[model samples]
Target: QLEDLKQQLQQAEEALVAKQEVIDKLKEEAEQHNIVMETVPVLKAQADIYKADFQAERQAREKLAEKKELLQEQLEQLQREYSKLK
Candidate 1:
């Protein structure tokens, strides 16, 4: 009985290994994994460039808003002084 089960396990392991190899072979044969690994750095570098561009654009918008706020404050102050004089 024990011998029969051992034989069965060995046969099953071999069949599993062969089936797994066939499935893996079907998935990717070329330098697919290596090619994607190489491009990871390239893609990350591109992401950094976009991040920097966005930050620069956001800073420009913030500066414009600050300038606009300053101008409005000065205008309001002038208008109040004119009212006081009148």
Candidate 2:
């Protein structure tokens, strides 16, 4: 009976060790997942900021193009008038 009890104790200790190892692995995975979750939002926010900046730059470029077209038209009109005077 004593030997049987010793065998059972050894089995229980081995089971406990296995369970502890599993718990440790799960804890490490949870920590890594949390880190990734935390970084995701920051990256998304940065992406959004860049998107807004790009949109603003595009709008500014369009406005500049329109102004350049108007200036070009005025210059052509002036050249035509000058040719008429000549």
Candidate 3:
């Protein structure tokens, strides 16, 4: 009977240890979840800023192309007049 009682006590201690381990695992998961939640908005804001900068750069490229075309056309006109004089 004493041996049986000792076995039962050992089993109870093991059960309590198992329960504590599960609780700790759950706590760690909760912390990880909260960290992601906080980080998401900051990351989204950074993405938005990068998108805006890309759009601005594309617009600048288009304007530069237009200016180059205008200058080329004027130079061609000047060369044609010079040929007529020759």
Candidate 4:
């Protein structure tokens, strides 16, 4: 009976060691999760900055295109008047 108890104790000790390894892995996973959570907001902020830049550039390009069209119309009018003069 004493030998049987000794065998059971050894088995229990080995199981504890295995569970300890699992706990270490669980702790590591939790740490990595925290790092990802911290990084997400910074990534989101960077994406927002990129979006703002794109909007600003799009508005600027639109304004420039409108101005270009206006200038083209004026040039056409001038050409027509000059041809009439000629």
Please give the lDDT score at residue 48 for candidate 1.
100
Off by over 4 Å in 3: 76-86
All candidates in order of TM-score, best leading = 4, 3, 2, 1
Q: Supply the global lDDT for candidate 4.
A: 0.98
For residue 63, give model 1's deviation from the true position in Å. Answer: 2.3
Q: Candidate 1: where is the Cα deviation over 4 Å?
A: 1-30, 84-86
Residue-level lDDT tens digits of model 4 in 1-43 = 9999999999999999999999999999999999999999999
In model 3, residue pairs whose N, Cα or C atoms come closer than 3 Å (at least 3 residues apart or on different chains), thus clashing, are none
Over 50-86, each residue of candidate 1 has an lDDT whose tens digit, in order, gives: 9999999999999999999999999999999999989
RMSD to native, candidate 3: 2.3
Q: How does candidate 4 fare on TM-score?
A: 0.79
Residue-level lDDT tens digits of model 3 in 1-86: 99999999999999999999999999999999999999999999999999999999999999999999999999999999999999
How accurate locally is residue 86 in candidate 3, as Cα lDDT from 0 to 100? 92
Query: Residue 9 lDDT in model 1?
Result: 99
For all candidates, what are the clash counts? 0, 0, 0, 0
Clashing pairs for model 4 are none
Q: Cα lDDT of all candidates, in order?
A: 0.94, 0.98, 0.98, 0.98
